[PDB]
Design a protein around this ligand. Structure first.
Ligand SMILES: Cc1cc(=O)[nH]c(SCC(=O)c2ccc(S(N)(=O)=O)cc2)n1
Ligand SMILES: [Zn+2]
Length: 257
């Protein structure tokens, strides 16, 4: 039922998922002047050398590039995290226009898109158990602006016409997510939630300050995907982002300055 239209978009989700109005919802606006530099925060450790991508899936909301997370191969640690979080998938949220699409904002600035690399805390054994814990997930968020192409994104873009509609998947092996990272790992972090239903409050968010640049042609191909299934009226997959939610009783911390 839920999605991103007038009839079933973010402003409706609370009726099936009442935590939509909870105390630690995501995304948020990152007010860079009031984020506190925390000299106790560690460099993030992103260890993606042995990542094993398997498949890419249009799930009707976004596309997910999925990884084999049955061993400790692509892991996030350090930063604000205790313990070791394993990469399970990444996906993006993007707009119908270059001036919107990100979920997080920075001093109210929206970016053209935002990439989420989703990781789960290995102390909980698997992703389905982790989402039921307040420290179950760590999502690394990276902003996309439109400018020069991102060469490490092109393999993803070029497979999208094979997964145009909801429910389609394609083999997607040997994809290296290190090609999607900016140069700096400086970040903001705060406790929050999944940004789509079920909206569970299980995520430590780590949002990088440096955006990556993608070309206008790369994001135009994201906007050619469809939310609908094959044989249904075409609804372009655009504007699949949740707007910023109330910060409430939270403190965003900065790893830098
Ligand atoms: C309990 C449960 C199980 C599941 O398979 N998916 C979900 S929601 C989908 C999901 O895995 C997910 C959703 C949103 C985000 S986000 N947009 O916060 O990074 C990350 C992962 N919830
Ligand atoms: Zn997301």
């Amino acid at each position: 039922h839920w999605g991103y239209g007038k009839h079933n978009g973010p402003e409706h989700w609370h009726k099936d998922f009442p935590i939509a109005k909870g105390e630690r919802q995501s995304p948020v606006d990152i007010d860079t002047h009031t984020a506190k530099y925390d000299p106790s925060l560690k460099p993030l450790s992103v260890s993606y050398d042995q990542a094993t991508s398997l498949r890419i899936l249009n799930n009707g909301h976004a596309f997910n590039v999925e990884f084999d997370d049955s061993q400790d191969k692509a892991v996030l640690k350090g930063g604000p995290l205790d313990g070791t979080y394993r990469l399970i998938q990444f996906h993006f949220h993007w707009g119908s226009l270059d001036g919107q699409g990100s979920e997080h904002t920075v001093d109210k600035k929206k970016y053209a898109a935002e990439l989420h690399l989703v990781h789960w805390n290995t102390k909980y054994g698997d992703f389905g158990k982790a989402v039921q814990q307040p420290d179950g997930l760590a999502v690394l968020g990276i902003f996309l602006k439109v400018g020069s192409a991102k060469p490490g994104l092109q393999k993803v873009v070029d497979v999208l016409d094979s997964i145009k509609t909801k429910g389609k998947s394609a083999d997607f092996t040997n994809f290296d997510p290190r090609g999607l990272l900016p140069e700096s790992l400086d970040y903001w972090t705060y406790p929050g939630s999944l940004t789509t239903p079920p909206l569970l409050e299980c995520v430590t968010w780590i949002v990088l300050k440096e955006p990556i640049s993608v070309s206008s042609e790369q994001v135009l191909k994201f906007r050619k995907l469809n939310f609908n299934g094959e044989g249904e009226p075409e609804e372009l997959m655009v504007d699949n982002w949740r707007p910023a939610q109330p910060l409430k009783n939270r403190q965003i911390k900065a790893s830098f300055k």
